[PDB]
Design a protein around this nucleic acid. Structure first.
Lengths: 62, 103, 46, 94, 77
RNA sequence: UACGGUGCUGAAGCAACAAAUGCCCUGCUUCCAGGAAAAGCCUCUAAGCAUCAGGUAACAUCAAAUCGUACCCCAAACCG
RNA sequence: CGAAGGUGUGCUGUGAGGCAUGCUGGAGGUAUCAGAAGUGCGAAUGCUGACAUAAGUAACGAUAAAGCGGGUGAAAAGCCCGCUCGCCGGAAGACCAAGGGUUCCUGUCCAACGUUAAUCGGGGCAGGGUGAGUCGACCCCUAAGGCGAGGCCGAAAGGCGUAGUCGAUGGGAAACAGGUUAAUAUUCCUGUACUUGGUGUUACUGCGAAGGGGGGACGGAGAAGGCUAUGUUGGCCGGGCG
RNA sequence: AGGACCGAACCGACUAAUGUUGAAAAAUUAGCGGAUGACUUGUGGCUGGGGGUGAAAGGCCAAUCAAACCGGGAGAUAGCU
RNA sequence: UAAGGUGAUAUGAACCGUUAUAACCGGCGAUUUCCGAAUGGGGAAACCCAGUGUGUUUCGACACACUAUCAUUAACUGAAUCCAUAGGUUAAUGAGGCGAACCGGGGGAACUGAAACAUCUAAGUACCCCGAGGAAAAGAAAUCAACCGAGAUUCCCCCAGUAGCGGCGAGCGAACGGGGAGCAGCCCAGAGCCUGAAUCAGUGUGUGUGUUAGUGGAAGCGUCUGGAAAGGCGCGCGAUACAGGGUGACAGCCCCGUACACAAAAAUGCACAUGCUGUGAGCUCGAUGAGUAGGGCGGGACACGUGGUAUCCUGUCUGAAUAUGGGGGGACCAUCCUCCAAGGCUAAAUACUCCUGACUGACCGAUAGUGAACCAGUACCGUGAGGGAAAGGCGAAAAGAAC
């Protein structure tokens, strides 16, 4: 995902990060109750937020 | 670097099932493989009410050491050893006898 | 009978606590000895 | 103004219990599990923004983890924060 | 401490040999005296804690060179 | 009614006397052994601020965070 | 086609010992001749572990006390419910600080813990339970005392100490009554309040401290007077006619 | 008014019994002394070992005191068992 | 590098990947809560309380950075008191704390031996403190030797338990000289002549060789006992590989390896070579470390305990010569010999292993070897410093016993 994400602006990365964080919050709330039967999505969204934050620190301030 | 892989047809060299051949089901990280229908054990499977398993004397394959099976060379109808060599800058396996590339 | 151990967390920390040991040279040596020995709980502090 | 991403991290899970259900149906108060370092303002803002409900007041308490015993080894569960969020009159939540 | 500012003398240790050759530990302190020296160059008084030998060196060498040595040695006066 | 408790309704709800070691009392009387400190609070101005800043009165609005709150506590849970 | 080890038997040498073999055991052992020792155990009130003995004996922890019917259960003197009896009641009742840290409440289990049985428990497992502008801590302020910029002193480490800064056990703002949970309540709900700070409109005008003064601000004992918490009696209200 | 009197809480421990592998490594029962003072108690602090503290017994200094406890010199030395 | 993975007890669930951003290993990065030198102030460690500046604000408030102390340097400011100094405020650089042993320095016992004990010994040992480095210290003769000569410092073997020292007791114990490991000599107390000329340190680039992942890597079948063959019995093959480990009993030829031959995009160590910066080389003349050497008094180190005691250091009082001079040659004097102190630097031989990798053992095999083969400095004991255990093996494979 990192290669595809690298050709994006700082504001695009920020809005993508915000969408990912909201998605993560919905997944967490859904997983609290027994509704969520796809446990891998939590780790997936977490690694996506990690990638976006890494790319943000890589681009800005360097 | 592994000589025995998933879809390889192998023949058992030592043990109670010596001579028989079969397909490797899956290779375990401990240096053991499960060959289809060879090392059959009878497990006294206990019933569990959740997941709805009846529980019975099930028969299933048990793991076996990679050191006890050798790759089967269909052409010569005998066991063989695996060697490594590079063809088109891509590492491939070949039978030690007849020195042809393993498909 | 009144036994010798009358507990008090305030007195406990003020007498054998981490800051009390680190205030002086000798306490730091005690801490160094315990770190060399590999103690799980360095001081009396919870 | 507390940041949005911080709001998105304050709420952990809904607390499900008999007392929680009783509070929800009688005093219009939902019992949520929140981050251990969250303030009442952060919890109120997070519920108001993410759930689109009007909050009246937030009451919080810190729950001590129990000391359990896994076989022979003695272990301790993690401490967590619990928040009683009282929604305004007429509001409805899932 | 009992340290001569100029010559660097400090308390040393030794023995008190008796007539029966019994040795008990003792110290030898420097003959320290606080004294105000007239620094003609700066036109002022600088008070140093010096030994008698320190006073003799200040007399022989001159106060200016001694102050230069103190500055080079990082001593404060 | 699950015999655990839950729901609805509800009369009189006054007077006299006794009386504390509690309150007036950080008081009063008396004695020598002559009985903490600092801040909050009220007031006064020095530099400075000159119709600005500030101050006090009313009204409106906002805020009061964080941690403890179970349980034993003259004891089967603390010190032995 | 059974090694070392373990346990019997037979033979052998003057002796420490050796050889063969039945059974158990299930993978190592080692002739001969030399070499090196953590080289031979019954004793050291020897060290560690195991198991006897006294002995199924003493004891089962205040001489405040138990009796019965019903329930659960495989089993009830001890658990639950009901009727009697007894014990504390300036405590053997109720609420806190200190200290402990989930022992609190519910469901479930009796292997180990309870000096007996155990369905019971402060025991095991799982779930639940601690809601604060007003209670307490945090915060503002200091006592004894600690640390202590510079500083003085000291072979070094370091000692004392100024300005400061901590340190409650003392000073400083404000909430009560009723109801509710199995477990929280001056925290939740209902009704009625109060305090301190920002901002914002109007009206009024000398504001300002690291300084000055007041106040906070203080001992022991004794004597009345007025009260209240609280109690007794009468009246009133509901029930009763043994 | 009082280091006054009788007597509870509170502080202490004079006499006897029990207990001495105790309910307790000093306590219980029945008596006893002080009980507005040189009283007693809660919280925090200060005094460190040849040192402290002592209404003074060489008492006490974490069930240890004619020199605490822990580590080190240290496998002290032992013409003794 | 890859056809298998999402660390372990520890299965299960939901998934990723199979020809290359699945997973794993390595290089360089990014993130790195709070406490701890802890560094914005405080503190009962993992907690409480701020100030300044720059941004946002849906005016409720949020985010980021800086703010400890001391040393040195620079600027501004600034008393008593005229100038000034002390003090104050900024900015830059550095230090603080931890760590097993080795090293140098500042202090420094006693038990013990003398068959008691005080001189003496144990011993400059144990211990405490300061400072630094991969080594440290020492170091280029005011050194020995004996009329012949040697040539800095350090360490090893002799000299030698000798000469001596010593209640001449117990004990302590050299040096001269010889054989080795290793070898290196310079600079400042000051000027002229030629001007950057040897060497060293820092920072780049290039080459070689390692280090941090890895690649290829030979050759066995039949039969008997056996649960199982690697064992027995035949017949082969490989070896620069018969080191080792695993595999159903003992495997050169079944697997991982080993001998051998290869490999780095990136970072780094060590030898070189070179660019740049600082630094100076050589010749002539001049100078030769003053409260210092020596001395009186009291100690200490030299094997040397004040003895006839030379030599070195100094707490106290003094005190020269200065190249025509001075020190030493074991009291001291004359002759003779040798050296130039009172100023520094310097690699190698030397000492040690907290840590990493490879190999070895007439070293141990669960009361042994680390206290700890095992979730051990843990449970437990103590207020605390501190003390400190017990506890390993089913089986080849859980096939862990359905009914």
């Amino acid at each position: 995902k990192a290669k595809e994400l690298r050709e994006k602006s700082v504001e695009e990365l920020n809005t993508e990060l915000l969408n990912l964080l909201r998605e993560q919050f919905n997944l967490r709330m859904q997983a609290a109750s027994g509704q969520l039967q796809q446990s891998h999505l939590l780790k997936q969204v977490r690694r996506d937020v990690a990638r976006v934050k890494t790319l943000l620190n890589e681009k800005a301030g360097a | 670097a592994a000589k025995i892989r998933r879809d390889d047809e192998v023949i058992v060299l030592t043990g109670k099932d010596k001579g028989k051949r079969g397909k490797v089901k899956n290779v375990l990280s401990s240096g053991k493989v499960i060959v289809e229908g060879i090392n059959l054990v009878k497990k006294h499977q206990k019933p569990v009410p959740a997941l709805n398993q009846p529980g019975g004397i099930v028969e299933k394959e048990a793991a076996i050491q990679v050191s006890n099976v050798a790759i089967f060379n269909a052409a010569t109808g005998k066991a063989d050893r695996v060697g490594f060599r590079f063809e088109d800058g891509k590492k491939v396996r070949f039978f030690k006898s007849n020195s042809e590339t393993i498909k | 009978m009144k036994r010798t151990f009358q507990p008090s967390v305030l007195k406990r920390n003020r007498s054998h606590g981490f800051r009390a040991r680190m205030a002086t040279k000798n306490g730091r040596q005690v801490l160094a000895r315990r770190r060399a020995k590999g103690r799980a709980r360095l001081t009396v502090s919870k | 103004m507390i940041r949005e991403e911080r709001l998105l991290k304050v709420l952990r899970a809904p607390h499900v219990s008999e007392k929680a259900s009783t509070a929800m149906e009688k005093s219009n108060t939902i019992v949520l599990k929140v981050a251990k370092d969250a303030t009442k303002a952060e919890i109120k803002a997070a519920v108001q923004k993410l759930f689109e409900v009007e909050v009246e007041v937030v009451n919080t308490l810190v729950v001590k983890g129990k000391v359990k015993r896994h076989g022979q080894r003695i272990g301790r569960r993690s401490d967590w924060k619990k928040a009683y969020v009282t929604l305004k009159e007429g509001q409805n939540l899932d | 401490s009992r340290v001569c500012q100029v010559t660097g003398k400090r308390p040393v240790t030794g023995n008190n040999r008796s007539h029966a050759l019994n040795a008990t530990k003792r110290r030898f302190l420097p003959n320290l005296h606080s004294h105000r020296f007239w620094v003609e160059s700066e036109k002022r008084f600088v008070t140093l804690r010096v030994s008698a030998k320190g006073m003799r060196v200040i007399d022989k060498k001159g106060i200016d060179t001694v102050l230069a040595e103190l500055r080079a040695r990082g001593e404060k006066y």
